[PDB]
Homo-oligomer: A and B are copies of this chain.
Amino acid sequence: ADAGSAVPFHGAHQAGIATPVQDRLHFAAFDVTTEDRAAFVALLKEWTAAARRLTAGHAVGEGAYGGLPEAPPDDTGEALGLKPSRLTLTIGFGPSLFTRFGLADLRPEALADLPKFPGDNLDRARSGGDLCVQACADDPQVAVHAIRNLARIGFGKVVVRWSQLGFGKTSSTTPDKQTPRNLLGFKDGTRNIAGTEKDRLDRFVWAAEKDGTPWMTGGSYLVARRIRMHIETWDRASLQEQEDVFGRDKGEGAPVGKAKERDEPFLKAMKPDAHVRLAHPDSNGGATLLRRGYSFTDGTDGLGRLDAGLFFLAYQRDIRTGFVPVQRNLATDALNEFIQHVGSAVFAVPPGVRDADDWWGSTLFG
C-alpha cells in the first residue's frame, strides 16, 4: 500500500500485524464495564461496522454533519477530508476479559501471564486491560479520530484504561524499505519477520488449530511493553560502548565486523551480553518474534530532561514460546543499563474479519 491508500480490513488475519508498518500509533487499552454479554456482542458488531468505515476513509454512522441539527453527529468530524492513510485497527482481548461473560474455559493457554522479570517497575495503571485497539496510520489525526470514535461508540460499555501514542515507528515488516531508527539512534527492525514471509508467519506468528484453542486459529498473541530509555545515561556513553551494547555498528547497522546492515550476524564476534546476541533466535532455541513497536516521548520527566521511550509490541504464535524465553534471556543484556520496563500487557488477537457479515471476536462469542 502506497501513501494515503487503504489497507483492506477483511481477511483471514487482522490487518496491522504483517501489514507494512505505518508511521504513527495510537494504542488504547479498554476495560469492560457491562456484565451483559449480549450488549457487549452488540458493541463488537457496532465497532466492526465503524472500523469498516474508518479504514476506508469514511465517517462512521450517518456521517460528520448533515444530520438532524439537534442531534450530536455520528462521527466527530476531525478526519473529514483526509485519506485512509493506511489506517489499520487491530483488536485484542486481555486475560482479564475471560473472567466475564462465561468465557473462563475459553482462555487460550498461549495467552500466558508474563512472569516478573528483573528490573521491572510496572505501573499497574498503565498495564493490563480487558481489551485493546491498536490504531496504526500514517496520519496521527486519522489514528486519533478512530480511537476517539470507537471509545465514544462504546460509552457505557467500555472505558479507556490507558493509551499510548507512538510518534514514529521503530520496527519493520518490509526489509525492502529503509529500517527506522529508535531514539538510541540505532536501526531497529533489521532482522524481523517480513509480511511476505508467509512460511515464517505461519510458524512464528499465527495461531494454528492444532495449538489447542480453535477460536484463535488465524489470530496471534500480543505483548506490549512500555520501555523508558535513560537517554541521559546513554548519551554520555561512548560510541564503542553503544555499539558493544547491541553488537551492530551505529551508522550502517551492520553486525560487528561486517559491512552491510543485512549481512547475517556472526554471534561469536559480539560481546556475550550484546543485545542482538542474546535476542537472536539461535540463542533462544529458535524463538522468533514479530516486533512492531514505536517510539514515544511524553513531555519531560520533571527533572530537566526529555522523557523518551519505546512502546515495544511483539506478535507471536504463543507467548510462552516467543516473548517469554527471549525476554528471560535478556536478563544479562547490556541494554538493561539504559532501559526500564514500566508498563506491560498481553492480549489474544483474534482471527481476521472474514467478510462484511463477520465481526470482531465472532469466533469467541459465536
Contact = CB atoms under 8 A, between A and B. Distances in A.
A167 B147 contact: no
A173 B79 CA distance: 12
Copy number in the complex reads 2
Interface in A261-310: 295, 297-300, 302, 304-306, 308
A251 interface: yes
A249 interface: yes
Contacts of A295: 141
Nearest to A81: B178
B298 A299 contact: yes
A137 to B, nearest CB: 9
Interface string A231-254: 110011111101100000111000
A249 B174 contact: no
Contacts of A148: 183, 231, 235, 306, 308
A318 to B, nearest CB: 31
Interface of A: 3-4, 26, 28, 31, 64-73, 76-83, 85, 125, 138-142, 144, 147-148, 151-152, 155, 159-165, 167-170, 172-174, 178, 181-186, 231-232, 235-240, 242-243, 249-251, 295, 297-300, 302, 304-306, 308
5 contacts: A64-B250, A138-B170, A140-B170, A161-B304, A165-B297
